[PDB]
Each structure stands twice: as C-alpha cells, then as structure tokens.
Design an enzyme around this catalytic site. Structure first.
Site, PDB file in Angstrom:
ATOM      1  N   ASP A   1       0.808  -1.244   0.000  1.00 24.78           N
ATOM      2  CA  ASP A   1       0.000   0.000   0.000  1.00 24.78           C
ATOM      3  C   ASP A   1       0.829   1.276   0.000  1.00 24.78           C
ATOM      4  OD1 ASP A   1      -2.359  -1.443  -0.019  1.00 24.78           O
ATOM      5  OD2 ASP A   1      -2.788  -1.259   2.129  1.00 24.78           O
TER       6      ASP A   1
ATOM      7  N   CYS B   1      -3.138   2.726 -13.585  1.00 25.47           N
ATOM      8  CA  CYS B   1      -3.965   2.727 -12.332  1.00 25.47           C
ATOM      9  C   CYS B   1      -3.546   3.960 -11.536  1.00 25.47           C
ATOM     10  CB  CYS B   1      -3.870   1.470 -11.474  1.00 25.47           C
ATOM     11  SG  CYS B   1      -4.885   0.082 -12.056  1.00 25.47           S
ATOM     12  N   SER B   2      -4.165   4.193 -10.401  1.00 22.10           N
ATOM     13  CA  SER B   2      -3.962   5.406  -9.687  1.00 22.10           C
ATOM     14  C   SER B   2      -3.828   6.588 -10.662  1.00 22.10           C
ATOM     15  CB  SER B   2      -2.770   5.206  -8.776  1.00 22.10           C
ATOM     16  OG  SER B   2      -2.571   6.315  -7.955  1.00 22.10           O
ATOM     17  N   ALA B   3      -2.810   7.417 -10.467  1.00 21.07           N
ATOM     18  CA  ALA B   3      -2.593   8.632 -11.243  1.00 21.07           C
ATOM     19  C   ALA B   3      -1.796   8.332 -12.514  1.00 21.07           C
ATOM     20  CB  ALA B   3      -1.885   9.660 -10.403  1.00 21.07           C
TER      21      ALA B   3
ATOM     22  N   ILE C   1       1.607   7.648 -12.834  1.00 22.88           N
ATOM     23  CA  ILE C   1       2.956   8.257 -12.888  1.00 22.88           C
ATOM     24  C   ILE C   1       3.925   7.498 -11.954  1.00 22.88           C
ATOM     25  CG2 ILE C   1       2.030  10.452 -13.707  1.00 22.88           C
ATOM     26  CD1 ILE C   1       2.383  11.586 -10.892  1.00 22.88           C
ATOM     27  N   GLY C   2       3.468   7.004 -10.806  1.00 22.30           N
ATOM     28  CA  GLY C   2       4.387   6.447  -9.813  1.00 22.30           C
ATOM     29  C   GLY C   2       4.797   5.023 -10.137  1.00 22.30           C
ATOM     30  N   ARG C   3       3.910   4.093  -9.786  1.00 17.51           N
ATOM     31  CA  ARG C   3       4.105   2.655 -10.082  1.00 17.51           C
ATOM     32  C   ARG C   3       4.151   2.435 -11.598  1.00 17.51           C
ATOM     33  NH1 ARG C   3      -0.228  -0.316  -6.039  1.00 17.51           N
ATOM     34  NH2 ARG C   3       0.211   0.983  -4.196  1.00 17.51           N
TER      35      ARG C   3
ATOM     36  N   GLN D   1       8.213   8.425  -8.946  1.00 18.92           N
ATOM     37  CA  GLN D   1       7.803   9.485  -7.999  1.00 18.92           C
ATOM     38  C   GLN D   1       8.761   9.647  -6.832  1.00 18.92           C
ATOM     39  OE1 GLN D   1       4.696  11.734  -7.392  1.00 18.92           O
ATOM     40  NE2 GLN D   1       5.562  11.794  -9.456  1.00 18.92           N
TER      41      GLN D   1
END
Ligand SMILES: NCCCc1cnc2c(-c3cccc(Cl)c3Cl)c[nH]c2c1
Length: 503
Positions: free
Chosen positions: A400, A434-436, A438-440, A481
C-alpha cells in the site's frame, strides 16, 4: 531553474533564511531529513514562517490543504500562477511570490565535490567528449573549486583537458577576475552562456556535464554497492532537472475535459497525449483521455494512463481498440486503504458487457502468486470481424505504501508480459495504468525498458537509469515518484542480471 529547493537545510535554518533574507511571500521547499517522501514548503507571511507538509508515498505529491501534483516544479508553477489558492488549516491564503534561491551545488549534474585532479582527467579522457565539464573541490587550495573541461575532436593530441581555478572569497565565486557570483551555479550558467576564451583562441565551451551514471550492465553490482554505502544524492540530481520538463498541458485543462482527470492538476503533456478519433459526433470534445505515449528513445512502446473513472471507461476501451493494444498492465488493486485506485472496467469472468460502441468478453481468469491474468475479447459493436484478444495482467501484491522488499515478483511478471507482447504479430503499445499513472506506472515502464536492453544485448551493454527516467519524464509528468522507486529500479536491474548469470 528550481533554485527554491534546498536539499540539505534544516527546519531551523529554513526559518532563519526566510526571516533574514526573505520577505512576505518568500518560500522554499526542502526534504525532511529522516522521512523520504516527506517534504516541507516553508513560506513567509505576516513576518512569520509557516511550514506546509507535502507527502509522497509513491503515487503523487500531496500538499496538505492543497492539491495533488506530479512534480514539485509543477506544484510551485501552479501556486505562483494562482493567488488565493493555497490555504492554511483555518482557511487564510498563503501566497508563494518570491522563490528563495539555494546556493548549494550538490544536486547539479556537473558537481563532483570529492574528486582529485588526475581522477577528473581520467573520467574526462574516457567518458567525456568535446565540451564535457565538471566542477570539483580544490585539493591544494581549501575552500576553492576547480572547473575541468574537455575540448577537441571525437589518443593523438587532438583533444585536451583545461583546468580553471575557482576562488571562493567571502561566499562569492570568481575565475580570477571580472564578475563575482553568489553561487557556483550562477558562475557556471554565466560561462555556459559566455564561454571563456584562452588567449591563443581555444573556447572553453561547457556543452554537457560529465556523465558518471552510464554504467556497463556487468558492473551493476558494484555501482549498487556504492550507492548503498548515495541513491539519495543521485535521485535529487535527477529531480533538479524536472524544471526543464514544464511542457504544456492545455488540452487536459479545458473545461470539457476537467472531469476526465482523476486529479485536476495531474495532466498529460499535449505533445505526447493519446488523441482519440472517431468520437460520438454529438460530443463537443471526444478526443481526450488522460494518457500519454511513451516511446523509448536512445522498440516496444507503452501507453501510461490513469486508473479509469466511471465516466472514462468508454474512452479507455476506445483507446485500447484504436491503438491496437493487446496487453494491459494494472499496477494497483481496485481498492487500497479503503479508497478506489482504479474502477473495474472489465466484465466478470465468462460475462459480456458493452462499453459504449465497444464490446468486451471476459473469456477466462487465471490466478498466479503476484497477479491475475484476464483474457478479454474486445470488439466493436456491429462489426463482427474486429474482435481481438487483450490480455490483462493485474499485479495484486504491491504494498500500500513504499515498494516491494524484493523485485523477483515484479520481474517474473514483466518477463511474462514481455513474452505475451512478443508472441502477438503487430501488437500495439502495452497499456500500463492505475492510480494517477505516474508512480508505479513509471516504475514498471522504466524497469521494462532497462530489462529489454539487457535481454537483447546481454551484459555487454550500457545502461543509464537516470537518463532513461528523464527521457520517460519528458513524455509524461513525474514518471517515477520517489527515491524508494528509484532504488527499486536499480535493485530490479541487479536482480535481473544475477539470474541471467545463474543460467
Ligand atoms: N551531483 C552528482 C553528480 C553525479 C550525477 C550525474 N548525473 C546524474 C543524473 C543524470 C544523468 C543523465 C541525465 C540526466 Cl538529465 C541526469 Cl539528471 C542523475 N543523477 C546524477 C548524478
């Protein structure tokens, strides 16, 4: 320029700077010295300093009492262009007016503090080309610096290295005459623009900093050992360059597209966004999805996108169809921490659903340790022969917060994703989301790019993790990120090299 970021200042040092050298509206950003993913925005207002936390657990920068951003530069740009928009807990407006500039050179690609004169000649002789330069602390003159530059034609004497002594007198820097600069950065910028001339005519051009991050793949273990002993400094140098990546994002800002974005200020660059064609002729703007093409440069391509909103699921399927994508990678659970990270956009196993003009069948789901594979059949309604299989790889075990403590799971996954893509004739780009987005997403894509170089050319190729990241970041904001993601990329490459040596 991003001078408002102070990489090695304390909370007390930050107050004193703003109180003694700033005015109301002065501000700076800094990291929390034992909490990666924590940053502070220090701001002067009413002759007193206020500290605002920014948190990044791996998906976005989240400003307390403000918005979510893809980068600190985009965050500062936004608030320096919008009065009354940043608010205190009680609701007073905090204005960012005047960046308070940092003189610290440590996050500059050209600054190699600890480095001797002959050590600098070796590096420049080998790794450097015409105009390659660096700045090092002086050995023989404590407190001073040295600027080392290569010039010539790209061992016959056609090239050479020139040293120029930089004096530090009373916290100002000079080359022995002329202008006295407040920081080594100001000095380097000035001679970058107005090159020094030797009497005999050689122009000491500063074209590019010496590259010390490009490594051969077989020496990954030694570089990782070195960065472990830092990963932090190398990462911060990368983040400093994000001010060169403030490309326009106008289409995502249009009123018609506002509600198509998961976060209002995390938006696709105009020049790489996926344009959707053949939209409902009645719909004013039907060409927009929050997604970008990522084309690796210096032959698989990707689309990086956000998790769907309930009102963008139709657009998502239009995009998969239009782009001929046959493989989707999902990097989050549907729900994490009790919060929706990407809406379900696929049918239940064995079911068929229509998503506007698209029809999707879920043919079969297969459970693996770290992921679920869903074999989907996508077709256009009314058009039988347009059917293609789309393989959705849903990674389910990413923690998480933070990153996996071991990269084997992710690497086994990407290996299988890669073999699927490679088995399908003329498949379009691999969708990663998924999410935004950019990160994962950016972490999985970077690892995938690096691993493919190593899979094709073997352990006799050169990789450069930060250059690769900067190239992906020029195509979507804030790809990769956090410093934990950054270290995880190095660890995955290393792990992938260790198992290839196991064969
Ligand atoms: N003051 C640290 C000097 C050592 C150094 C040099 N270079 C980079 C890089 C980088 C490499 C290629 C391209 C780009 Cl755009 C970057 Cl930022 C990211 N961390 C770095 C650290």
């Amino acid at each position: 320029s991003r001078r408002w970021f102070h990489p090695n200042i304390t909370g007390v040092e930050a107050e004193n700077l703003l109180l003694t050298r700033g005015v109301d509206g002065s501000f700076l950003a800094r990291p929390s010295k034992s909490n990666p993913g924590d940053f502070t925005l220090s701001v002067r207002r009413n002759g007193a300093v206020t500290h605002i936390k920014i948190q990044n657990t791996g998906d976005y920068y989240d400003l307390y009492g403000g918005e979510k951003f893809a980068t600190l530069a985009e965050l500062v740009q936004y608030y320096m262009e919008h009065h009354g928009q940043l608010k205190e807990k009680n609701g007073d407006v905090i204005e960012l007016k005047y960046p308070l500039n940092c003189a610290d050179p440590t996050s500059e690609r050209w600054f190699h503090g600890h480095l001797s004169g002959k050590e600098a000649e070796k590096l420049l002789t080998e790794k450097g080309k015409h105009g390659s330069f660096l700045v090092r602390e002086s050995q023989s003159h404590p407190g001073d610096f040295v600027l080392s530059v290569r010039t010539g034609d790209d061992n016959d004497g056609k090239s050479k290295v020139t040293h120029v002594m930089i004096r530090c007198q009373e916290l100002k820097y000079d080359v022995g005459g002329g202008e006295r600069f407040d920081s080594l950065t100001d000095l380097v910028e000035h001679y970058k623009k107005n090159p020094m001339v030797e009497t005999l005519g050689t122009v000491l051009q500063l074209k590019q900093p010496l590259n010390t991050t490009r490594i051969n793949a077989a020496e990954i273990e030694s570089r990782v050992r070195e960065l472990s002993k830092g990963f932090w400094e190398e990462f911060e140098t990368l983040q400093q360059q994000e001010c060169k990546l403030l490309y326009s994002r106008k289409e995502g800002q249009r009123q018609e597209n506002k509600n198509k974005n998961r976060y209002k200020n995390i938006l696709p660059f105009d020049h790489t966004r996926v344009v959707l064609h053949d939209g409902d002729p009645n719909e004013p703007v039907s060409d927009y999805i929050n997604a970008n093409i990522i084309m690796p440069e210096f032959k698989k391509s990707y689309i990086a996108t956000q998790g769907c909103l309930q009102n963008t699921v139709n657009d998502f399927w239009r995009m998969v169809f239009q782009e001929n994508s046959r493989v989707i990678v999902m990097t989050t659970k549907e729900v994490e921490r009790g919060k929706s990270k990407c809406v379900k956009y696929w049918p239940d196993e064995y079911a068929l659903k229509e998503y506007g003009v698209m029809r999707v069948r879920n043919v079969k789901e297969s459970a693996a340790h770290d992921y679920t594979l869903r074999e989907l059949k996508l077709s256009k309604v009314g058009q039988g022969n347009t059917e293609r299989t789309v393989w959705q790889y849903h990674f389910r075990t990413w923690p998480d917060h933070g990153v996996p403590s071991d990269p084997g799971g992710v690497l086994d996954f990407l290996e299988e994703v890669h073999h699927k893509q490679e088995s399908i004739m003329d498949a379009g780009p691999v969708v990663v989301h998924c999410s935004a987005g950019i990160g994962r997403t950016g972490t999985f894509i970077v690892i995938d790019i690096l691993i493919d170089i190593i899979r094709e050319k073997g352990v006799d190729c050169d990789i450069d993790v930060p250059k690769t990241i900067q190239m992906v970041r020029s195509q979507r904001s804030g790809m990769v990120q956090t410093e934990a993601q950054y270290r995880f990329i190095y660890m995955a490459v290393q792990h992938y090299i260790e198992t290839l040596q196991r064969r």
